[PDB]
Symmetry: D2
Subunit: 404 residues, 4 copies
């Protein structure tokens, strides 16, 4: 049928077959899975190998939370294996850390690092700072004019006006001190604020847009070139994130007894320190690294991020880490280790954390959703878990490299 | 033995290979895990049934408790090098696939994109130590001689069919010597292959310099999974460039902006903005978004998005009336493969097959990985085009 | 003629000869400074493979009184650096004659051409955006939990007030700004920042830092001061922190050069200049992996002015940080807009080499010599503006030379 | 009594008279009336010094304070070597105090190192570092690489075209043609392997070559021009945008210099006995190492440094550079340094120190090294001029002296910081 199909669709789509809808070519089709099915069939005929989609699964997945929220042009889902590393003994608690990865040995190695920490009295961590950022670029007629705006934003009165505009957008919108940089007639303004338990990009962007609108009322000659002028900086390496922080700034530490270094990690404290200095400090320095003073923080960040519904593209900055090691204890034979991660971009509400499987992994760690009594606590706790697990990862890989 | 015993019998015995069957092994491990969690019901919506664990166990993941479904969208057709690609993207970020898809449309109506692979070579950068700086200097000089390099190359190349050692890059720090081994790796990403070659090459170097200590097979000089200027300047894995010209009409109708607006935003965001932020290699809008999405979909090492997303996006006016938009994306360090690791799994192979790059290329070793790298760079450009337009239009 | 060692000891300076004093040094004070230099020169010459090496190194008639125990030790003479003049530099409705000490041919003359282009373009305008010298000590506590506690303490209003009071007590020019702190495990890096009148401020900030750390130690007795400089300042090394946060004076300068002037004086076009600027100073520096080096030769101008005006020339490492921007301007879109932004000019008009008279002569040329009584810091800020303006002149001329080929 | 401008031109125009018969005021009047250019006063007047004197008098009138130049010296200086070579619009000279640090015990030789500075304690502190090295058996150094660079930017119509040029330059045949063109510009020109980087249709080409005992910027730039001209024969659609595209990189901080090297790449080392660390440096080996790790490595890391893993290499580099007629603006990259320290010896109480400097840009011929006072400081170190028997040896020796003196400076300042 050709003309009859248009009449039935006006009434609904359940009476029409799959081949009839394809003949003509989201909201038109009744069920979400059927929409995926038709899209897959249309796609298959465009590929040189239509049987490509055979092993890409799609059936029985809950698309209701994905459509119009997380993904478009959906043709199915990608299963990433999830392993568990733990217990991670952190701040007098014990965590079972979910890790989504396809790299062999990663989960097992991280698990060994956890064991080392666990037999060593446990790890301790602190959140040092919290605030997601957006760094728009604005332009004025002259550099003297951009200078005037910078000076105006630095006054208590000027900042209060911008803060009021920013804070009016959301419950959690609370503008911190502005960071500004001039480049001739350009002005780069770094807006920073806490965002409850959300990663905060949407919240900060909404606050930024309103703040820039209010700024335009005081400086009508100002042009808003882009709401992001890469001064944030989001999803690109930047020294500003390393020095100023972005999202959660975290530190974590543990002391590993000499006995544990030998038995669990198959190495010595002295060997670990020498590798740390010459690989993570000198090596990264020779390579021209900004913020990459670690062995494989990225491995742990990415694995946790994928498992817990985070924005995995943010591993670029979230993996920023300096790993430090020194001799400790009365006999100077125990291993003190610390990991400092100034730019963990993380959340427990919104985005991929709205999906049930991702919520399962968040629930494992007891951080799923918003914390009503203490806004931000779940996201802060997750950041502490990430930093702690990174340290476990550092211990085991460094031990492997030290032992050869 | 264990087949006749019940699930509760194995658990109470404790309170990997014994279970024999894969799924029941995952089931029991989940049950053991549940009693360690504050809420045992946490695992309820973490799926595990009916998944092919045979290719995972002892290869891709350990302590497996299930799988994480990441939604896969499609952006395309991507008109690249006279071909058309349907690009799979695994993401939970709303608007990403749709925005990338709009960028593809702009390129498609603009006559298509053209790309080139400029370099190919995975790297490993061990740190070795000598008694003195004079000694490490001697090793550096020895490695720089034709005969010295030939001996190391012979040892390196003996480890694998695809192992073919390129020119060594060496840096001294006192008595420390950092040696960057580089080689092609067929269609594999190559980390295991390069590491195996490196280990044998260092063993051979130790024959000539017996006082040399191999401190670490990776001294962060590679550099793997950390931001590093060396990857930006020297390249790592695949170095790729891609370009297109977008007609003024297409910029207006599809991208909802102007060529002039796009150029001004690109200069002041991607160049000046990144400069003010102190970026090394981050001269782009969101290359990382596209890299990560393709990487997860195509069984790549997503942790390598750190360096793989290195990108400089350039825009200028083009055409007779100087009103068309020329765009280029240059990505010097795409770390990518079509065999090994996550690319061994069937669902991941499905997305690779969509692009026609699955597995090793028999007739032309490396062609599939090179093609995928070109697709990544091209898709990045599509993403750049759409996001920049969104920012320029406000 | 030469007297025995025992007969020379009973007398000892003016009565003794030069040959006799040398014998006393070899056996194992002087009336004038110059003779003291002469003796040291003679002692040194014998140690050298070529005994007449110091022949053309001048030393006579120089005022060593302001140098000894203040600027240099083990003095064997002076190094004359040729000084040229570039100008007039038309900046902020004033005209400056800029002294430049250099041995690079074409530098002064090229910079002079840049000044000519600015002068025929209606002049330059500049602004000082920030002012504060920094010192970044490293302190260490028993644990990261402890260093975190100190960071939190320093971030409180009452915690900062106590530290500010201690810091500001060391000098009348001291005014401690908001602290920048960074943790690295049990390490804490604290970036102290304050204005310093017309001085570059390193000595002043360090003194304030020591006092502030002493006060902090009263509240945290377990804190170890590892180094008064933990490279977090950062002084005399390249550092993104200086680029992003600023150090000393942060300055911006701008001008519009008419199309006619670009053509006649600079021998190029506005279009060519912009194209070279984008692809050299932005894309080129990006490809090179530069942090803060988004310019043609700011270092040339900074160094030349610094040597001429008694600045710390080693500070050109950070002081030369610059981003040069160019775009089309004017009603016909044919004029050249240029800006230079320099966030970390480390500069002073009192103390160090600026205490010497020849160096003061060059400072007097620009009208910035000494401390401004009416407005503390005004002379140092003015000199910073002159540097940024002269950098822009240098940028115009070299970029034109490169564009024209 | 002053004379009219028309009469003064006839006196100056005459061969048997010149500016000798004209007064200062009459020459001043001729420049102000635009008959005589101010930048050519040295050639037009009988002596160079009077030419400088006239320019000073011209300048003094323009200033708000007419007596500003009073204490800026100019008399009795040899301008003949400066004019048309080192400086323009000369109004005198700036005396920088020169101090001596040493003996520096380096490679079984002893050096007395000249340092031009106005920073109090710098020479004396560096001298203390030398003394520590001397009692420690001396320093050893090695030159690892030698090659000045220039990094032009060229442009092609498309990225596919720039890719083609990159591939062409990477072929043995393509490189041989370019090397032939480059090397034909100077006797010392020996082009090393090219480093190329694409940015869309842009191509950045890093030319590197030894340059005898010269710093080599002019030599390399001349070779680059000829090589690009030859490349343009094969690729006529190529546009040479700039002979320097900041890919060199000259006088700006750049990771490329840190990683690839520029000029002379040098390493130096010494072992200081525990007794010497205690008595001379007023500290301990343990304290030195702890400060070095947390300041020069961790501290510089927290600050986001590329190449600045040291205490004050820039102080030593700048002081030697000014004293020895180097380009002091090149201390930006020349001061790149990583300082390393560890425990050494049978009892693990002695201090091993190393300094690695990948990008020392230095020469002993050309530029400011042509001036006699600067040559005096070069003669002190026995490195003045070109080494005929071994081209580059004098410049290489100076680079080793710089690295060794840096290490001396590092020892002393780090000791001061460790002791408090
Ligand atoms: C983390 C784990 C995946 C691992 C380990 C590792 O930890 N083990 C083998 C130990 C013994 C272990 C113990 C218990 C259970 C399982 C495995 N060793 N390597 C590794 C490194 C360099 C090399 F050349 C070849 C391999 C890798 C790959 C790291 C990789 O993803 C980043 C690495 O490149 C970052 C860096 O160090 O530069
Ligand atoms: C890519 C897409 C996910 C997107 C778009 C976007 O492209 N669109 C909205 C257009 C109109 C579109 C067209 C067709 C279909 C769907 C959507 N706009 N933003 C975005 C940017 C800044 C901002 F403040 C708030 C939002 C984002 C998020 C980018 C984000 O992941 C990296 C970004 O932060 C990197 C950067 O620019 O710094
Ligand atoms: C600044 C001046 C000293 C100069 C000029 C220059 O400005 N001129 C020649 C013009 C025409 C001029 C006009 C009026 C009077 C005198 C001279 N041209 N070059 C230069 C550049 C690249 C090159 F390959 C060879 C030479 C240089 C050397 C710059 C140098 O110190 C930093 C430079 O390397 C920084 C960079 O661009 O990378
Ligand atoms: C090098 C010397 C000039 C010096 C010394 C120094 O070495 N001494 C005092 C010792 C005891 C000494 C011994 C023998 C003879 C004379 C002097 N101590 N400081 C110094 C450092 C930080 C500080 F807060 C205040 C002063 C400085 C200034 C360094 C300065 O130019 C770069 C420095 O900022 C680089 C850095 O460390 O960040």
């Amino acid at each position: 049928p050709n003309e009859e199909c248009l009449q039935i669709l006006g009434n609904g789509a359940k009476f029409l077959s799959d081949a009839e809808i394809i003949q003509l070519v989201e909201t038109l089709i009744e069920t979400h899975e059927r929409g995926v099915s038709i899209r897959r069939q249309l796609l298959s005929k465009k590929l040189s190998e239509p049987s490509s989609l055979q092993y890409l699964p799609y059936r029985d997945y809950n698309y209701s939370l994905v459509m119009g929220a997380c993904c478009e042009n959906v043709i199915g889902y990608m299963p990433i294996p999830v392993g568990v590393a733990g217990p991670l003994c952190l701040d007098e608690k014990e965590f079972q850390v979910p890790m989504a990865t396809t790299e062999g040995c990663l989960v097992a190695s991280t698990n060994r690092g956890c064991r080392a920490i666990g037999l060593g009295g446990g790890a301790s961590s602190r959140v040092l700072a919290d605030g997601m950022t957006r760094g728009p670029v604005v332009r004025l007629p002259r550099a003297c004019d951009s200078a005037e705006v910078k000076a105006w934003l630095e006054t208590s009165e000027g900042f209060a006006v911008i803060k009021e505009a920013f804070d009016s957008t959301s419950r959690f919108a609370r503008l911190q001190k502005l960071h500004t940089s001039i480049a001739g007639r350009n002005l780069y303004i770094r807006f920073q604020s806490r965002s409850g338990d959300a990663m905060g990009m949407n919240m900060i962007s909404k606050g930024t847009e309103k703040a820039l609108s209010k700024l335009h009322e005081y400086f009508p000659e100002m042009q808003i070139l882009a709401v992001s002028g890469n001064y944030c900086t989001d999803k690109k390496p930047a020294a500003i994130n390393w020095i100023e922080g972005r999202g959660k700034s975290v530190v974590c530490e543990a002391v590993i007894p000499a006995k544990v270094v030998r038995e669990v990690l198959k190495t010595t404290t002295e060997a670990m320190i020498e590798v740390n200095i010459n690989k993570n400090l000198v090596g990264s320095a020779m390579a021209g690294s900004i913020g990459g003073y670690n062995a494989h923080a990225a491995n742990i960040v990415t694995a946790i991020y994928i498992a817990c519904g985070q924005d995995a593209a943010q591993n670029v900055g979230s993996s920023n880490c300096i790993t430090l090691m020194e001799a400790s204890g009365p006999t100077n034979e125990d291993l003190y280790i610390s990991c400092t991660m100034p730019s963990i971009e993380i959340g427990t509400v919104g985005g991929g954390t709205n999906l049930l499987p991702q919520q399962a992994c968040l629930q494992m760690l007891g951080v799923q959703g918003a914390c009503k009594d203490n806004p931000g606590e779940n996201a802060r706790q997750l950041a502490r878990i990430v930093c702690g697990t990174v340290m476990a990862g550092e211990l085991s890989l460094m031990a492997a490299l030290a032992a050869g």
